[PDB]
Amino acid sequence: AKLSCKICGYIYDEDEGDPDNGISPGTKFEDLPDDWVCPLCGSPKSEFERIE
Ligand SMILES: [Fe+3]
Ligand code: NA
Ligand code: NA
């Protein structure tokens, strides 16, 4: 699944992960650590929402 950051153009795709910051491809949103933030704008998990 994919989630948009409300605050910038970034999209977290679970099939991509966030590898530059230590999150492997295939990591589900539910499994991102509580201190994970948007790689571009620093917004927290509470500022992400599912998109298609
Ligand atoms: Fe962002
Ligand atoms: Na969790
Ligand atoms: Na970073």
CA 42 from chain centre, in angstroms, equals: 11
Q: For residue 44, how far is its CA from the centre of ligand 3 (angstroms)?
A: 13
Nearest CA among 24, 27, 19 for reference residue 3: 27
Handedness of CA 51, 43, 41, 24 (dihedral sign): negative
- Which CATH architecture is the domain 1-52 placed in? Single Sheet (2.20)
Instruction: List, in sequence order, every beta strand (DSSP E) within 1-52.
Output: 2-5, 11-13, 48-51
Q: Identify which ligand lies nearest to the alpha carbon of 21.
A: 3
Which amino acid makes up residue 34?
A: D
Cα distances from 6 to residues 9, 16, 45, 47, in angstroms, run 8, 19, 10, 6
Distance between CA 17 and CA 14 in Å, rounded? 5
Q: Identify which ligand lies nearest to the alpha carbon of 5.
A: 1
Contact 2, 50 (CB under 8 A): yes
Q: For residue 48, how far is its CA from the centre of ligand 3 (angstroms)?
A: 17
Method: X-ray
Strand 2-5: give its sheet, edge to edge.
11-13, 2-5, 48-51
In units of Å, what resolution does this entry have? 0.9
Q: For residue 24, how far is its CA from the centre of ligand 3 (angstroms)?
A: 14
Neighbours of 12 (CB within 10 A): 23
Contact 35, 45 (CB under 8 A): no
In the three-class reduction of DSSP (H, G, I as helix; E, B as strand; rest coil), residue 2 is classed as strand
